[PDB]
């Protein structure tokens, strides 16, 4: 059974996500337009930079997150940002044609579009696999916002100074997720759900290292870095 406290955590996270994820995708209008070699780079940089902003907003609402030192906040967000973009995008991901569908043809991103941002099949192949895996878990929105939160507040990130504090927050988050599954997620959806979810977090780590490699290689070309946003360069292309 969920405690009041645990219910309080979920309500907050659903409100946090709903404040920061717009399923009408109305803001996409503002991005540099998409063109269908590196013709999708300006549009997809804009999309990612916006999504970083939304992720920061979400992260801020996580119970305990604001109470961390400023430096630890930055470290958690810099390392997690792309992983949460990948988690959050599953909500626009469709298994009919393996694409992210954001309401209109112009904001429908398939494999070729991701390659026109400059990325290779070595990233794209595992990314789609991940999205199929995650979509087939049929997560409750409660589980989806908890997984994003647990992703962010990871004590085992390089650079983390107060790991015991980060861990204290993660555990409250983890036990909440675990208790939700048992008493609120019906079987056999509940069958091995938690371990599979934890396994997704490992996949993201791996996906992250492959994003980092391809991001470094591409944004070394100053012509490509120019096409980025200041926040992207600050979050990805820093240090």
């Amino acid at each position: 059974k969920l405690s009041e406290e645990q219910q309080h955590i979920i309500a907050i996270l659903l409100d946090a996500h709903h404040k920061t994820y717009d399923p009408t995708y109305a803001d996409f209008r503002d991005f540099r337009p998409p063109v269908r070699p590196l013709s999708m780079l300006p549009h997809l940089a804009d999309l990612v930079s916006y999504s970083i902003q939304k992720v920061i907003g979400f992260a801020k609402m996580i119970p305990g997150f604001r109470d961390l030192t400023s430096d630890d906040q930055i470290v958690l967000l810099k390392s997690s940002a792309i992983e949460v973009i990948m988690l959050r995008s599953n909500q626009s991901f469709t298994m009919d044609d393996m694409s992210w569908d954001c309401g209109s043809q112009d904001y429908k991103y398939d494999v070729t579009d991701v390659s026109k941002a400059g990325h290779t099949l070595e990233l794209i192949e595992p990314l789609i696999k991940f999205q199929v895996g995650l979509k087939k878990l049929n997560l409750h929105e409660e589980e989806h916002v908890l997984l994003m939160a647990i992703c962010i507040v990871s004590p085992d990130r390089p650079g983390v100074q107060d790991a015991k504090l980060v861990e204290a927050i993660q555990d409250r988050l983890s036990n909440t997720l675990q208790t939700y599954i048992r008493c609120r997620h019906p079987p056999p959806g509940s069958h091995q759900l938690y371990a599979k979810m934890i396994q997704k977090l490992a996949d993201l780590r791996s996906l992250n290292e492959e994003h980092s490699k391809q991001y470094r290689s591409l944004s070394f070309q100053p012509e490509n870095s120019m096409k980025l946003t200041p926040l992207v360069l600050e979050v990805f292309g820093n240090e």
């Binding site: 920061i56 930055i74 200041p230």
Partner: peptide, 7 residues
């Protein structure tokens, strides 16, 4: 850091 200011 504009990240710091978004916090």
């Amino acid at each position: 850091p504009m990240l710091m200011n978004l916090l």
